């Protein structure tokens, strides 16, 4: 079918913090969420046949994320996501990330696009990326931790085209993310 969907919120998340992911085209679309809490859901259309989807669990526990193309589930859907309770000491909203390799584009043929990640005002947590292009090919991003809570990371496009980078701290998608290039 015409529908791809990936990202942090199909695996994990934290309570009362939006579990997020991406859905791409390749009829009319739909989602539903069986879980221990009333989840609230929204697909923010980016314009480009892809849309930011976020739901809001209010209970620790496991939730089943059905994405549905027509009449019936996406390929791997339902996805099954274990939502963790918000640690007292984790601030994803307070993570910042930036640089040439997160723009519009300018990102050229085969060539490195830089970018950093400042997690210092962000408490304790596991960092995890999610990157696929405009065809659901995975994107490799070596991430080199400097030590001080900041991170050198880069990748190499091949295309005058769009690559999508999702960023999770403590399994929670980060502000300004998912970045589209």
């Amino acid at each position: 079918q015409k529908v791809r969907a990936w990202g942090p919120g199909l695996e994990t998340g934290q309570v009362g913090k939006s579990a997020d992911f991406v859905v791409e085209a390749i009829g009319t679309l739909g989602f539903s969420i069986e879980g221990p809490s009333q989840a609230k859901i929204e697909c923010d259309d980016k314009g480009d046949g892809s849309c930011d989807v976020r739901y809001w669990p209010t209970e620790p526990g496991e939730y089943a994320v059905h994405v549905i193309c027509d009449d019936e589930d996406i390929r791997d859907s339902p996805f099954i996501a274990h939502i963790l309770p918000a640690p007292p000491d984790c601030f994803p909203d307070k993570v910042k990330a930036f640089g040439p390799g997160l723009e519009p584009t300018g990102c050229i043929v085969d060539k490195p696009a830089e970018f950093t990640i400042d997690a210092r005002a962000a408490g304790k947590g596991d960092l995890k990326l999610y990157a696929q292009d405009a065809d659901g090919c995975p994107i490799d991003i070596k991430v080199i931790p400097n030590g001080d809570g900041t991170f050198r990371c880069s990748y190499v496009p091949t295309k005058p085209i769009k690559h999508t980078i999702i960023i999770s701290w403590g399994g929670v998608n980060v502000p300004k993310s998912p970045f589209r290039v």
Partner: peptide, 9 residues
């Protein structure tokens, strides 16, 4: 309690 929420377009 089990709950189911859902959206379509």
């Amino acid at each position: 309690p089990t709950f189911r929420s859902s959206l379509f377009l």
